[PDB]
Symmetry: C3
Amino acid sequence: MNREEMTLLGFEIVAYAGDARSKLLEALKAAENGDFAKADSLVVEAGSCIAEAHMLAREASGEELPYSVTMMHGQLHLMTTILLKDVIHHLIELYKRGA
Amino acid sequence: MNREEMTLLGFEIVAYAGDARSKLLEALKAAENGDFAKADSLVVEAGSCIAEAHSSQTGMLAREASGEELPYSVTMMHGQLHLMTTILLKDVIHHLIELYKRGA
Amino acid sequence: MNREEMTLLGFEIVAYAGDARSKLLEALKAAENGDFAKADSLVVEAGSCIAEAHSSQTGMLAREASGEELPYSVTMMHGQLHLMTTILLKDVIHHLIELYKRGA
């Protein structure tokens, strides 16, 4: 690829990751307010955005790939958002048990 | 910008993000110990360090979006990582603190 | 440092971080179920995997700071990415387990 493609790739990822993040934070908000159904529904929607966001093999299939800060920003956003998706069950569960 | 420049900037982001990260973790320790006022105060402080680093990151990304080619730097990558993971922690820290509050 | 050595080290960090990550999430599942001894044991194991990958990262980063131009490595960025986010998970896991323990 060239930088533009890596960059546009970054943006599309930032796009999905940004949506998923919003729903996850909104889910936490819902769980905080006791609306657990909304939280679960918001989490599933976040899961959907993440599903579509989804290099190493490409780099290994030679070398290549141009450095793009936007592309790493997109990956980083996606990964930190997935980390949130991976622990949100517990945050919500702790809210339920607390209530 | 040359690699050295990105590297220096990377250190600057690490300085602010590391500081904010320490404050957020200290706020969790505070909340864990029942000092909710200290916890909230520390988050407000972390937020100020994050805003500084975040606006710089935003500026740098827009430079690339606008066409400028930014050189690769592991230090910059490290700064971005420190900042973004720290931002995530901040985005959810209210919930970890509230949870400690309800049980305490 | 060689480009080969960068990709290699990159993969090692991804492996260690991936290994630590799995244990941390398994640790969360254990705590949620009240298996605290198991949850704590997994976090200790995960911390040991993180330490090895983290010290590699510290050396790699110090090389750039000293003026060394590390070959551009996408594999290494991903190494850094997984490692740093897994460390964030470890910082958060402590509190999630403690909240579960108090709830227990």
